[PDB]
């Protein structure tokens, strides 16, 4: 009953993460999101962030 | 609008990057779609931040 979500650059990840954020809202039962990540992997020196 | 798609398509194939020289339509922006392409004018996006 909990969890979170990340996902790449990708344009289909946001679409299906805006997707499954509209179906899960409008839900009778109960539902935690944490956060959400939309970290970028194309940087350079940016894998310690 | 018409002449990007076929080159685009053809070159997309061995995943070859194309640079676009008066292209402005916005039909081609996500990368999804179009894998690789370079622009040398402003997207009609930047209109709204005009």
Sequence with gaps: YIFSIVTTYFPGYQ???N???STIE???V???LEEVLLLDM???D???K | HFT???VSYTAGFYRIPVLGLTTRM???SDKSIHLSFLRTVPPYSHQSSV
């Design chain 1, 15 to 17: 679409d299906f993460v």
């Design chain 1, 19 to 21: 997707k499954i954020r």
């Design chain 1, 26 to 28: 409008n839900s009778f």
């Design chain 1, 30 to 32: 109960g539902w935690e």
């Design chain 1, 42 to 44: 194309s940087l350079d």
């Design chain 1, 46 to 48: 940016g894998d310690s």
């Design chain 2, 4 to 6: 990007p798609t076929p």
């Design chain 2, 26 to 28: 916005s039909i081609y």
